[PDB]
Design an enzyme around this catalytic site. Structure first.
Site, PDB file in Angstrom:
ATOM      1  N   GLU A  21       3.221   2.987  11.147  1.00  0.00           N
ATOM      2  CA  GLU A  21       3.351   3.564   9.799  1.00  0.00           C
ATOM      3  C   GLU A  21       3.621   2.542   8.711  1.00  0.00           C
ATOM      4  O   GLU A  21       3.934   1.368   8.987  1.00  0.00           O
ATOM      5  CB  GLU A  21       4.503   4.605   9.754  1.00  0.00           C
ATOM      6  CG  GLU A  21       4.115   6.099   9.827  1.00  0.00           C
ATOM      7  CD  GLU A  21       3.356   6.655   8.578  1.00  0.00           C
ATOM      8  OE1 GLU A  21       3.009   5.840   7.663  1.00  0.00           O
ATOM      9  OE2 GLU A  21       3.114   7.913   8.550  1.00  0.00           O
ATOM     10  N   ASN A 151       4.932  12.963   2.613  1.00  0.00           N
ATOM     11  CA  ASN A 151       3.802  12.084   2.928  1.00  0.00           C
ATOM     12  C   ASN A 151       2.845  12.005   1.770  1.00  0.00           C
ATOM     13  O   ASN A 151       3.113  12.546   0.683  1.00  0.00           O
ATOM     14  CB  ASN A 151       3.122  12.615   4.214  1.00  0.00           C
ATOM     15  CG  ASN A 151       3.248  11.676   5.401  1.00  0.00           C
ATOM     16  OD1 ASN A 151       3.061  10.462   5.255  1.00  0.00           O
ATOM     17  ND2 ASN A 151       3.442  12.256   6.615  1.00  0.00           N
ATOM     18  N   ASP A 202      -1.149  13.001   6.227  1.00  0.00           N
ATOM     19  CA  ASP A 202      -0.137  11.971   6.421  1.00  0.00           C
ATOM     20  C   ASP A 202      -0.206  10.969   5.246  1.00  0.00           C
ATOM     21  O   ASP A 202      -0.257  11.401   4.101  1.00  0.00           O
ATOM     22  CB  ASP A 202      -0.327  11.307   7.810  1.00  0.00           C
ATOM     23  CG  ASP A 202       0.555  11.910   8.872  1.00  0.00           C
ATOM     24  OD1 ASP A 202       0.826  13.144   8.828  1.00  0.00           O
ATOM     25  OD2 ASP A 202       0.974  11.147   9.759  1.00  0.00           O
TER      26      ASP A 202
END
Ligand SMILES: [Cl-]
Ligand SMILES: [K+]
Length: 295
Positions: A21, A151, A202
């Site tokens: 991430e 997100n 996301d």
């Protein structure tokens, strides 16, 4: 509808991430950075050479901003820390839910004013436990509350609109901003309703034309939306738990994509060993390098 682009890119790093991430690129050193959130690692890849370094953290880092050639800002589950890039020494900059052990940081992105937007969440994605904060010169201000999984944080080319989503809801919001500060000047409006459509919205980037490029968890895809919010393309990637894109390369003209192995059973990993890898797409993008955080 969207036009489908099968994957024709490459693997940037063959190491699988449990939860890859927060990728970002430093144009001055030609280095991509990202996190393995749950394992407390900060990953460093020098693009031209392929040289990979993994840095162990005492916290779960999830976002990185450049301050200068010698300093970075890291958002974590335990607060916001300065990182000296020569020594790796970490020093507290500001508290961020530093008294909420049940929460961690998640998605974040720099606004061109020099302020960070950063999301937090319950570690088990407890409903509504998360928030989005604005951080400028060490001052933390809550912007949005009652978010389960923050997100898709990103910004329009002129800094006058911000975007975000609650991945559990999948309604991508737009927010009018003061470009000079990165603070909202009006309420959030629904921009892209993708509720009930398979997969979770996301991380996202916003290109020089204002298109949003969103990693869709569970669908092995980066989705591209035009400035009206129409879904115009889907760019396939081998890791199905797609987490976040980043502009990379000397002209911000390539797209890096992280992915995750989190929650996947052993059979799934065996069937697709590319889960969790970090990729580059085969197509050109017209990106922009991330702004610097201003102390
Ligand atoms: Cl061109
Ligand atoms: K916390």
């Amino acid at each position: 509808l969207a036009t489908v682009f099968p994957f024709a890119g490459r693997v940037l790093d063959e190491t699988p991430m449990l939860l890859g991430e927060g990728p970002t690129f430093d144009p001055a050193s030609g280095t991509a950075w990202w996190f393995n959130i749950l394992e407390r690692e900060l990953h460093e890849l020098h693009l031209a050479s392929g040289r990979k370094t993994v840095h162990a953290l005492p916290f779960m880092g999830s976002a990185l901003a450049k301050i200068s050639d010698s300093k970075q800002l890291i958002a974590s589950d335990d607060g916001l820390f300065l990182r000296d890039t020569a020594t790796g020494v970490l020093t507290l900059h500001a508290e961020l839910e530093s008294d909420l052990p049940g929460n961690r940081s998640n998605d974040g992105r720099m606004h061109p004013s020099g302020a960070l937007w950063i999301g937090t969440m319950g570690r088990k994605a407890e409903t509504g436990a998360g928030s989005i904060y604005h951080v400028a010169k060490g001052k933390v201000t809550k912007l949005f509350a009652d978010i389960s999984i923050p997100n898709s944080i990103c910004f329009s080319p002129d800094g006058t609109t911000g975007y975000f989503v609650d991945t559990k809801v999948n309604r991508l919001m737009r927010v009018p901003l003061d470009a000079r500060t990165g603070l909202p000047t009006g309420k959030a409006e629904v921009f892209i309703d993708s509720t009930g459509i398979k997969g979770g919205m996301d991380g996202s980037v916003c290109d020089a034309e204002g298109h949003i490029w969103n990693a869709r968890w569970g669908e092995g895809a980066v989705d591209r939306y035009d400035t009206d919010g129409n879904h115009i393309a889907r760019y396939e990637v081998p890791g199905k738990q797609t987490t976040c894109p980043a502009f990379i390369g000397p002209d911000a003209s390539r797209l890096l994509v992280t992915s995750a192995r989190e929650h996947l059973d052993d059979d799934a990993i065996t069937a697709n060993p590319q889960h969790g890898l970090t990729f580059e797409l085969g197509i050109e993008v017209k990106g922009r390098f991330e702004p610097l955080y201003r102390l």
